[PDB]
Every structure is written in structure tokens, then in C-alpha cells.
């Protein structure tokens with residue numbers, strides 16, 4: 001429910017040009033309901049999200065590129 | 077996770093969760109006879125647009141908040 | 154005329170067949186990693202070192 005409610009608010013912000021303030025809505029874990037996190041003071045550095053997406057994608061891409069594993073037995 | 081710690085210092089748990097989820101959902105497509113190159117190409121495009129979207133619509137300039145921004149950023153961590 | 158050399162020894166034929174089978178096995182093993190739609194292989198050595 002929380003994700004659906006959270007997604008509903010964000011969907012409205014993108015399709016309605018006059019409801020752009022809903023981009024800041026996140027999660028209020030204490031009460032379990034969406035909340036404007038920009039006003040609530042829940043901030044993160046932009047580099048944390050940006051570098052996370054770049055690094056996670058490359059790591060996922062690296063594993064996704066494999067389709068065959070040869071595991072040589074140890075010499076001992 | 078170690079690389080994220082060295083170059084950022086935060087978001088270490090998130091990046092491992094996202095990467096595993098990205099791989100899990102990508103493998104579902106591969107099982108549906110979608111070629112991995114198509115999935116890889118799609119993931120690369122989405123990562124580029126996600127970064128572009130963040131830098132254009134989801135950033136807040138800290139000069140508009142003053143010292144309270146630093147405390148809130150520290151408190152959130 | 155009629156018949157030719159008997160060729161009593163059979164080992165040369167077996168050796169040739171085994172060589173061909175091994176070469177074909179190697180080629181079929183690495184066939185999947187060819188072309189723009191080819192995927193990579195992960196090889197883990199006896200020491201544990203991993204290469205993709």
C-alpha cells in the first residue's frame with residue numbers, strides 16, 4: 001500500500017504540471033504514510049544516488065554477460 | 077560495496093540491494109528468450125536517463141537552505 | 154588386382170578420430186562466445202583466481 005500510495009503521488013506530479021511539489025514525497029517510517037521529505041528534512045547528497053546507479057548497473061551488467069562457468073579443480 | 081564506501085562513503089547497503097535486484101529482474105527477461113545484449117543495452121540507457129532525470133528535476137540547491145541543510149543531511153545519515 | 158593393402162593396424166585411425174573429436178569439442182565449447190551476440194565465460198583457476 002505504501003509504495004502504491006507513494007507511486008500514485010509521484011505519478012500525479014509528472015502528469016500534472018501544477019502538482020510538481022509532489023516530487024519531494026517520500027516515506028515516513030515512524031507513522032507509515034507518505035510525507036514531503038524535503039520539508040521533513042530527509043536529504044541525501046546527490047552523488048550518493050548517482051554513483052549508486054552507475055556502480056550497480058555496471059556490476060549487474062558484468063554478471064549478466066556470463067553464460068558459462070569453468071571451475072578448474074585445485075592442483076592440491 | 078567496498079568501492080562505494082571509498083568513493084562516496086554512504087549508500088553502501090543500497091547499492092548492493094539495487095544491483096542484486098537489477099540482476100534478478102534482468103535474468104527474468106533472459107529466461108523469456110530476450111538476448112542479454114538487449115537487456116544490457118536497455119539497462120545502460122535507463123541508467124543514463126535516470127542520472128539525467130535526477131540532475132534536472134530532483135536536485136535541491138543547498139544555498140536555499142543554509143546551515144539547516146547540512147544538519148538535516150547529517151541527521152538523515 | 155581386386156583387393157588392396159589390408160591395413161591391419163587400426164591404431165592410426167583411432168588416433169585421428171580422437172584428435173578430431175577433441176578439436177570439435179573445443180570448437181563447440183567456444184562457439185557460444187562468437188559475434189556481437191556472444192556471451193563471456195567465467196573461468197576460476199585452481200588457485201581461485203577468477204577471470205571473465
Ligand SMILES: Nc1ncnc2c1ncn2[C@@H]1O[C@H](COP(=O)(O)OP(=O)(O)O)[C@@H](O)[C@H]1O
Nearest residue numbers: 027028029042085086087088089090091152153
Ligand atoms: N528520517 C528518515 N525518514 C525516512 N527515510 C529515511 C530517513 N532517514 C533515512 N532514510 C532512508 O533510509 C535509507 C537508509 O540508508 P542506509 O542503510 O543508512 O545507507 P547505506 O546504504 O549507506 O547503509 C536511506 O536510503 C534513506 O533514504
Ligand SMILES: [Mg+2]
Nearest residue numbers: 086087088153
Ligand atoms: Mg546510510
